[PDB]
Design a protein around this ligand. Sequence first.
Ligand SMILES: O=C(O)c1cc(N2CCNC2=O)ccc1Cl
Ligand SMILES: O=C(O)c1cc(N2CCNC2=O)ccc1Cl
Ligand SMILES: O=C(O)c1cc(N2CCNC2=O)ccc1Cl
Ligand SMILES: O=C(O)c1cc(N2CCNC2=O)ccc1Cl
Ligand SMILES: O=C(O)c1cc(N2CCNC2=O)ccc1Cl
Lengths: 276, 276, 279, 278, 278
Amino acid sequence: FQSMSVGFIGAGQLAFALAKGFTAAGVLAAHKIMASSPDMDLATVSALRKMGVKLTPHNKETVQHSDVLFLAVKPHIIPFILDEIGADIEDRHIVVSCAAGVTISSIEKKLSAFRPAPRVIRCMTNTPVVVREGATVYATGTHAQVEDGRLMEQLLSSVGFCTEVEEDLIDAVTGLSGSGPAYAFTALDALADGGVKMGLPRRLAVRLGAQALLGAAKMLLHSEQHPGQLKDNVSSPGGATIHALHVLESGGFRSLLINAVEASCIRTRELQSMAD
Amino acid sequence: FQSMSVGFIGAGQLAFALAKGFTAAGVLAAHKIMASSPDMDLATVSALRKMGVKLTPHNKETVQHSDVLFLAVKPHIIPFILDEIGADIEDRHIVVSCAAGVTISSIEKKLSAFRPAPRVIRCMTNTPVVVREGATVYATGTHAQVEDGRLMEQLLSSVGFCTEVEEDLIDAVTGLSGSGPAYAFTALDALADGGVKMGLPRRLAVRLGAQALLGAAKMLLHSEQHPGQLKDNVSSPGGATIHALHVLESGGFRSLLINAVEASCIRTRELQSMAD
Amino acid sequence: ENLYFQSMSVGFIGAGQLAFALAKGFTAAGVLAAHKIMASSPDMDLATVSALRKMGVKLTPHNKETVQHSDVLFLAVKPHIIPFILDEIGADIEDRHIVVSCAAGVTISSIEKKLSAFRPAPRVIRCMTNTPVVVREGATVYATGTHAQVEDGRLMEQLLSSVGFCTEVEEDLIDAVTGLSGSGPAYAFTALDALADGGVKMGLPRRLAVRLGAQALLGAAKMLLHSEQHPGQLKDNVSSPGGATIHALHVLESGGFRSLLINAVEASCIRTRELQSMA
Amino acid sequence: NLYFQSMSVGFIGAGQLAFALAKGFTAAGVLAAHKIMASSPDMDLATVSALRKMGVKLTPHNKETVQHSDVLFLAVKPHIIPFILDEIGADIEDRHIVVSCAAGVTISSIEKKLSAFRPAPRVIRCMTNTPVVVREGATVYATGTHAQVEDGRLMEQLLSSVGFCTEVEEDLIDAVTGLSGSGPAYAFTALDALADGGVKMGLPRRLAVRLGAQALLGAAKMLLHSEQHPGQLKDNVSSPGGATIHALHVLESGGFRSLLINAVEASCIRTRELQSMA
Amino acid sequence: NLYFQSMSVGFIGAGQLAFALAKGFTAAGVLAAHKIMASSPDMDLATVSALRKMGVKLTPHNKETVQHSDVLFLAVKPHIIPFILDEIGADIEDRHIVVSCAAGVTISSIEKKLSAFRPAPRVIRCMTNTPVVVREGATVYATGTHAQVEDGRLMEQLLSSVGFCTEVEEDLIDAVTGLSGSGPAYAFTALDALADGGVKMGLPRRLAVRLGAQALLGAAKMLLHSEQHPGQLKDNVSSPGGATIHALHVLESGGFRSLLINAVEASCIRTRELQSMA
Ligand SMILES: O=C(O)c1cc(N2CCNC2=O)ccc1Cl
Ligand SMILES: O=C(O)c1cc(N2CCNC2=O)ccc1Cl
Ligand SMILES: O=C(O)c1cc(N2CCNC2=O)ccc1Cl
Ligand SMILES: O=C(O)c1cc(N2CCNC2=O)ccc1Cl
Ligand SMILES: O=C(O)c1cc(N2CCNC2=O)ccc1Cl
């Protein structure tokens, strides 16, 4: 809505990305956002201040300011935030935890000791929300009203893809779209090295490799076609592309990306289990 | 311009992509485009017909129709097209070869036997022009007027990134952004397999992996930051993402993408050398 | 049927595995009588020569008698034997002959070069088929030579279509076809033996494991041939999230399973070009 | 000339396997499509959309499927089975044959659930695969404690109309799942790659796919109709010094055989984990 | 207390190496920035933008650099050198020392070009690296046919103000290029990865980078100031049974040493190819 007030506990990379995306989208006004942080000298904190986001060192102040309260701290800090500000949670509050692995149940258990029906949502988003091309899923807690999930989808749809999921899919989403941008950054660096190796200036190589990945992903999102079909479409017989595809297969390219999604998903499960 | 008439020799994947992108951009009207093909029953030919592109089985007819003439056939077919329609090339014609590896000099040599100052351009684009997110470079030939390169940049900028390069960079661009989308499609298929392996429905996994790659590439294009810095930004200490990055490094992920750009670039050079 | 009543005489120079497989498929198809086939071999002690005799095929040690008997003459000897064969019986090739080379790598040009020294317009077709013609499920391509009539190509297609898939190609595709469907059955036999080993490792009787593995590959291949779907889409449709199949696909990927099959198709194709160049 | 005039078939679950069996059974002529009913909690699936075109009755309510059906196929994920069995267990009748198609789920676990509601549930466990859609499936089945002799023969009759089918001891089914249950996906992966190889060497993609699939089909048929060892058939294609034996060498150098062994094992091992997780 | 009052330095090329040497020389106090001139065909480079902030004279015309300069550094790509030498060869004077910094390009090829215009060109070939920007470069040089004794001593004086510098025989320079020319990039890659390792084990990225870089700097210093073999110094850190020897084992298992040998060789081999291509 318009009257809506949003707060972040955590003023790191994710909070900045979300706030910058929300304000760019126009769904939120920077002055309706407050962030708190233990280190008020972070680079991300300075930038929020230029954007017009309110800033404080006191999580309690962010809570009293906020209607929607995003939890954007590390997983092992979540149990402490909840103990710190659990008494300050009111009926009007929707708590949106963005921490990897941390379960709705563990958040509801800590918060229920203060007030009995805390409205909790768990989400997994990623940094490209900063350019309003994020990928976000969310699961609704026990006491989240029906309007809570819809308000959440409205807000996070404005900065990229958003869809509701069962909570037991979120650990796998973390390995895929949560960690995904880092796989892409690693890939682009390497593709740029390849271009440079074959004679391209670095800056041209980075722009071309990025544009290639962006356009390809866009083609897949705008197509009903399987990605192998689109690969077929662009692999001319005997040509350059099919030769490059072979050397990727020879190194087990596909299995490395499977390994990655699996490794991130399994680590996310450990971050949960380490909580309880 | 508006009066401009464009033709394609070749009605395959690339011709459709370019025509669909040009018409979507609004820089060209479908009725100002003509394509010719030896197999008038191709799926890409049927689609051009629905778009309103004129179609013919006679390359000579496309040439007489066209002011800008795109050559969108396989590299070993180019020498035959030029022999077929070389007498039909007029002063007003700009010949834009999109074939991998085929040099401006080889095109100018064949065409100069008919008329002495053929205006030739070599380009390397990719299929994401279909969603107006292509990556394109071009080099100007000996007799291309100054307005020719600018008209070309105007047209191809409307369907994605475009920049002029020295011709000796084009073989490396082919390995990077020419073959790039196929690396991305392979990557997305594998990332989807990873998501499915960890419990996601296939359709959700494909959408999330694609959105992740798109958003990440967009972040890099909108940033002055090095891709390793953006990787740093999203690799939380001890977290899921840094664990996945390790297993990518353990398989030599980076070197496989370097291998690919190199293999495609080297194959492109063979496709040229095989001509001469 | 229409071909049966054409009452064609067929010859094989070379009485090996392919000659036997084609003879067995043509007769099973009812398009040729076994005794309307004649095959020659310098070695009449091969097992395939005995199998051919048993089914009623005529056998002779003299290639000239095969040629004189034949209307369609299949050259089914090793590539390096082809030029010696053409020297020997080039004088006996007649204007009525359609000469079909099945040898890997050997080009129409090289065959026509030899035979043009005798009659001026040898009718030559180059073929790449495979041994599952023996169960009428072969995979065949052919290219027509310089003097091959349009009816020659249609007849060859009608004949090879009776024992499986058959289609005309430009000759410059045949080396690649050899690497794919010419050698393909051997890739599948290796895969079926390995899958059976896997089933036995996990506790299945060998007989059952072999049966199930082969039935699994047959049905998947049949699904693909009857679907308009990409094989990756079919793979997606069978890969239940979190399930047994996606876990097995991972271990395939981790060994570069896909690259091995690409490697094999390339290695057979490359070898096929060497077999031409060495003779 | 088989046909089951007195049999009503139901599917709990309207996914890829349900569509494949329903399509195979109707193409085999053994069942009128309108004598099939399927249920699913997402009546917006592509498979549920195709089932309506066939004429299969579709409902959202699993209780409706059970009441309509004699033979009831459980074609849902292994972890959904215990919930299904709780939901409809009070609707299982003496006439019902329950045929579970879920990977890993034992006859014992299914009978334990249903016996709470009514003693002597007639349970069969089967492992089939999607090529039943072209009547070339590979199916095994094991009969439960209270399945009658006519129940197994009947299920063999029905599933034999869509491919190979034999009875097995239940403790072989996890291994069958790794071989023929997952097998078609190994083949689709192999055909994608073989086609990639054909394209590399210069073939059009469409021809490469056709030829690769034809090669595999014909080789599988040869083995099925031959009494000979697959190594013997491989020997018959491998001309001395030739192209095939050179390619076979590069498969061996990659450990191609061990990868397929690895696959059957991993799928089998995972199937056992799907039992114990539920 | 070194300073070259009578020396005018010019750079043909205004890229990373030109900026690094110009910055090192000015920080060393040996050259006023305004006594440096650099030329480049793209006066829109980030390096050319930084050079103007230093006070270095910048021109687009290579002829201007030559006329301003006594010591002329060729800091362009190897394939550009022959074009540069054709463009300005008629402007080379007796007073000029030409110092080529291009990988691979021999003294012989440079002298052949310039001798067409004027006999006895004074040519020095050097291989340096970008840490000259922090006065810790590693530089070798070889003197040409017509370089006087004072020319080499002078160039050693100048480049010693920004790091290690020694004269070598020219046929060692390709190998030096693979070791110290490319070396810093091996180190940047190693520091990125070591930091990735620190982050994996729970350190903030900024601390991990700092500590990794400090570790490397301190180890390099230890070796430089020790007479001892690097294996001996490694032995001194590897406490029996401890953390370091366990990590060293995993480096050995990956063939870590051979990768660095591979790198020096590949860079050296490529450097020789850059000579022969031009
Ligand atoms: O994979 C190839 O070899 C390839 C082929 C082309 N095209 C399009 C039309 N004619 C060509 O050569 C473009 C880019 C690549 Cl990278
Ligand atoms: O790499 C990680 O472990 C990771 C961490 C997060 N965030 C952001 C704020 N708190 C978190 O846990 C989100 C996604 C991932 Cl994939
Ligand atoms: O890949 C799996 O895990 C798998 C899953 C199934 N199905 C179908 C319906 N319920 C199941 O479990 C069957 C065979 C396999 Cl091999
Ligand atoms: O493995 C080979 O080299 C091979 C050999 C043949 N034949 C049959 C008769 N003469 C040949 O060359 C056919 C197919 C292949 Cl794939
Ligand atoms: O390699 C080790 O295990 C190690 C050991 C030590 N020291 C010094 C005295 N006692 C220790 O444990 C310090 C650092 C490391 Cl890295």
